[PDB]
Amino acid sequence: MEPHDTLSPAQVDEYRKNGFLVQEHVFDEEEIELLRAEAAQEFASGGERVTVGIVRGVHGCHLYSEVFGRLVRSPRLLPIARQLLRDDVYVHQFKINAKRAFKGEVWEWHQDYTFWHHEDGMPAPRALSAAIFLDEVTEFNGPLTFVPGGHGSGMIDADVKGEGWANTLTASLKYSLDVETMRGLIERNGMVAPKGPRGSVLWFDANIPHSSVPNISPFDRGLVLITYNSVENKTDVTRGTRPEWLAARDFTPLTALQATSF
């Protein structure tokens, strides 16, 4: 194992100003293939934790998979999440999202924090997601798309639908940011679909508004998304509506994987 990875001051400034940031080539192909293979196994035996008719999402895999439980403690990831949240951290949510070639949905503009505040009891937006690129993310395979700086407009009052947590997981969403709001935000800030090669990591703020469109390429777009939360900002488990595999309840501070002979 190396020195723990840190963002440079420039990277940090870029992250806070925009609310997202791509580090290119964090993992190699061999590491990425190990993650691809484990993701396929979870898609195949995830059960109620899966989302679809062909499988498209799985939730909570770091609680059940040894590979994924080590991934979240990796020295390429955990220290940056400590650095950005300025705290010890733990994993609130883990999920894999594949958009297969010539497939996919329009994911309505939204803020993760909005769901986590109302569904899970997250007190403050002191959280972020790391989306590992299992495939090259381009213009055409349905990249996550953001309003840069749009996290600074706090949580935005949103159109609310559904009952329970049934449509938290699906592309028609329970909390969709208004059309009139979006225009203002976008007139003001613009739109960015960060791109990069396989093995890249895209860090994004819990309150950044984001969306994506379908994949019109012949290449799949697999993403592993790890949502780190600050231990100080642990969710209020008394207001909690959802289960462990969507919203974690073990708030033990994580420590990084140590170098071992196995």
Which residues sit at the interface with a second copy, rule CB under 8 A? Answer: 101-102, 106, 109, 138-140, 145, 179, 182-183, 186-187, 191, 193, 211-214, 216-219
- Do the bridges between strand 201-205 and strand 50-51 make them parallel or antiparallel, or are there none, so unpaired? unpaired
Minimum distance of a second copy from residue 250's CB (angstroms): 36
Distances (CA, A) of 121 to 38, 41, 80, 229: 31, 31, 24, 12
Residue number, 11 or 138, with CB nearest to a second copy? 138
What does the alpha-carbon distance between residue 133 and residue 205 come to, in Å, rounded to a whole number?
A: 17
Residue 194 CB partners (closer than 8 Å, separation 6+): 20, 22, 137, 143, 144, 146, 202
What does the alpha-carbon distance between residue 14 and residue 201 come to, in Å, rounded to a whole number?
A: 15
Touching ligand HY3, residues 161-180 (CB under 6 A): 168-169
Minimum distance of ligand HY3 from residue 29's CB (angstroms): 27
Residue number, 189 or 230, with CB nearest to a second copy? 189
106 binds, options a second copy, ligand HY3, none, Cβ within 5 to 8 A by partner type = a second copy
- Kindly state the number of chain residues that form the binding site for ligand HY3, as judged by CB under 6 A: 5
Residue 136 CA from chain centroid, whole number = 16
56 binds, options a second copy, ligand HY3, none, Cβ within 5 to 8 A by partner type = none
Minimum distance of a second copy from residue 141's CB (angstroms): 10
Tokens of 141: 């395979």
Residue number, 122 or 254, with CB nearest to ligand HY3? 122
Minimum distance of a second copy from residue 213's CB (angstroms): 4
What does the alpha-carbon distance between residue 48 and residue 54 come to, in Å, rounded to a whole number?
A: 14
Touching ligand HY3, residues 73-132 (CB under 6 A): 110, 112, 115
Q: Closest Cα to residue 203, out of 103, 96, 83?
A: 83
- List binding-site positions for 2-oxoglutarate: 95, 97, 99, 110, 168, 212, 221
- List binding-site positions for succinate: 97, 110, 210, 212, 221
